Amino acid sequence: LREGEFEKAHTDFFEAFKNYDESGSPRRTTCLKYLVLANMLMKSGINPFDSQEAKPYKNDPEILAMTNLVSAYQNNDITEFEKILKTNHSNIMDDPFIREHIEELLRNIRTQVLIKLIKPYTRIHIPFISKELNIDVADVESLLVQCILDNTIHGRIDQVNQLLELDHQKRGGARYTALDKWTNQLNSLNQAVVSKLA
């Protein structure tokens, strides 16, 4: 998790949880919390207590907060995620390993909610997204910049009018590219044909 390999962390925490299940508590519950954290950070496991050993442990009052958080992350709900983070404050924010990645996870939900929000629009206001995602205008533009740069969002930003001009204008561009290469090749060919005579 420190390096960035979330799939290898998920497998490591799964096998470690199996060994801690064979031996016993108290590291079992914490390892299960780190397993759910790795399931969410992997983007996305979304089925921790549907696997094998974690099935009856979901009812535990200590790790119930992670069940609520993994379901909120599964449905992509920021309001619910922040509500569980406010209700179960001490259960999550006391541990530094979860507190360090909680902002990355929050941004991962915000990205998907934004993707679900941009789909029906061709031109969308930035203040609207700021009020819809509940995040500062500058952080909205920063998120859109990072997201377009990583090719997750297909579109561009109009910084002057403060809007997001989404990529929609798609027509039969495939013909004009073929006609373009046909033109280039005909140019070089006619030059080579005329080159024959002297």
CA 178 to centroid of chain Cα atoms? 36
Q: Decide whether 93 or 178 has the Cβ nearer to another protein.
A: 178
Q: What is the DSSP string of 64-89?
A: HHHHHHHHHHHHT-HHHHHHHHHHTH
What angle, rounded to 10 degrees, do the helices at 78-87 and 64-75 form? 170
What phi-psi label fits residue 155: left (phi over 0), alpha (psi between -120 and 50 degrees) or beta?
left
DSSP type of residue 95: S
Cα–chain-centroid distance for residue 78? 13
Q: Does 125 bind another protein (CB under 8 A)?
A: yes
- The verdict on 121 binding another protein (CB under 8 A) reads yes
Q: Which of 113, 194, 118, 125 minimizes the C-alpha distance to 161? A: 125
Cβ proximity to another protein: between 51 and 146 the closer is 146
Pick the stretch among 23-31, 33-41, 46-54, 152-160 that binds another protein (CB under 8 A): 152-160
**Is there binding between residue 114 and another protein (CB under 8 A)?**
no
Our CB check for another protein shows the closer of 30 and 76 to be 76
Three-class DSSP category at 158: strand
User: Contact between 107 and another protein (CB under 8 A)?
Assistant: no
Smallest distance from another protein to CB 117, Å: 8
Among the listed residues 4, 22, 96, 197, the single contact to another protein using CB under 8 A: 197
- Chain residues in the site for another protein (CB under 8 A): 116, 119-125, 128, 142, 144-146, 148-149, 156-161, 163, 165, 168, 172, 174-175, 178-179, 181-186, 188-190, 192-194, 196-197
